[PDB]
Amino acid sequence: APSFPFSRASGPEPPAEFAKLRATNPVSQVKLFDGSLAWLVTKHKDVCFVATSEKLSKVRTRQGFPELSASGKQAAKAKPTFVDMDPPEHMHQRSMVEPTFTPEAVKNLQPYIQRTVDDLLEQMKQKGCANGPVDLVKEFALPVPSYIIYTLLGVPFNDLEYLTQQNAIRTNGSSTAREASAANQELLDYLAILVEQRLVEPKDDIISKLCTEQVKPGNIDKSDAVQIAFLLLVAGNATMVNMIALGVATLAQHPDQLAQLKANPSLAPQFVEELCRYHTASALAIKRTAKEDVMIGDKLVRANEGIIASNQSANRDEEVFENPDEFNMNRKWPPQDPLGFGFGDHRCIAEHLAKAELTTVFSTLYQKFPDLKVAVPLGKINYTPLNRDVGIVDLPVIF
């Protein structure tokens, strides 16, 4: 059984194993870091089954849960938030914060999203690139989702820049463990204090809604509110940063499609849909353990055996998406959903917010900077390490 996670075939490409497994052995066993075996599911139809089957559990203290690293094994010990819950606990807690992320709520946020993107682009323009390329990640891709989610949570404007840097330090590949866990503690301590404050004078933010509607009535206590706030911050931010940078890089690699977006910014939504299928930047979140024996394809998955469902592989599934390895924002979409945001009850709470952020970015960026160019040869883009989710560490641009 091969070791899993697999390595990406190159900087921007999924692991090569997935295409072979889809063709010859679509439900197979893999070996995890601790020697245990897990089932790997690779076809779109089977990923959807794993994401919705009531015989499968997300509870991480169940025997067989497929932790992929040593830190996940010990993180399993903490009191769970709704990301690690089964029904009915899952939606009981998820519904406490879902109101901010509905399509109606995200529609009302759209002027604020546009203003955030506008302001940060104008700052980048004023900084200029007269003294060399600027890092699109540091200058734009990082602050855009960071400022927005921090602001929704209730962080005051003056604290955004420091806290944006701390959260980046958490996930930066060159941070030592001491740097990353210090940045983590910094974030937790700040949120605890913000929860204390909002308990005394609520404002109009997510933390205030939790304090008023759930902590004070006694449905949760303030430490749960901290954990939930922390989950909403760290679950998708690094992914958002990577998607923005990957979109720029992808467009530099497909000049004809960038020219179409320049001449018709209304194609941004279609570009975003294809971006999220092609570059599946969160590919290791759909994991389960079997509560009962369950049959998947031609395999029997025994109770207490772990399952990993690759939505990255599903998004390249030849049986669903014609020419899946071509990036084509003009593709015709089948009836099946792309699975960039997962599937079923656990499907990304922030799907609509994420798409609205991405859509706002790519309908504005090249109107503001029509001559935006990646400043290094495309073969020299600094992608994330091949053993991690696809992403871009830094992206020097001129404009």
Ligand code: HEM
């Ligand atoms: C392009 C950006 C993003 C992508 C591709 C993405 C992707 C995903 C995926 C694949 C999952 C697993 C869903 C499943 O288990 O089926 C997920 C879950 C989740 N994501 Fe995101 N995400 C993004 C942005 C965000 C943002 C901005 C936030 C928070 C503001 C967020 C918060 C969450 C949470 C809380 C969950 C767990 C939901 C649950 O288990 O009920 N994500 N996301």
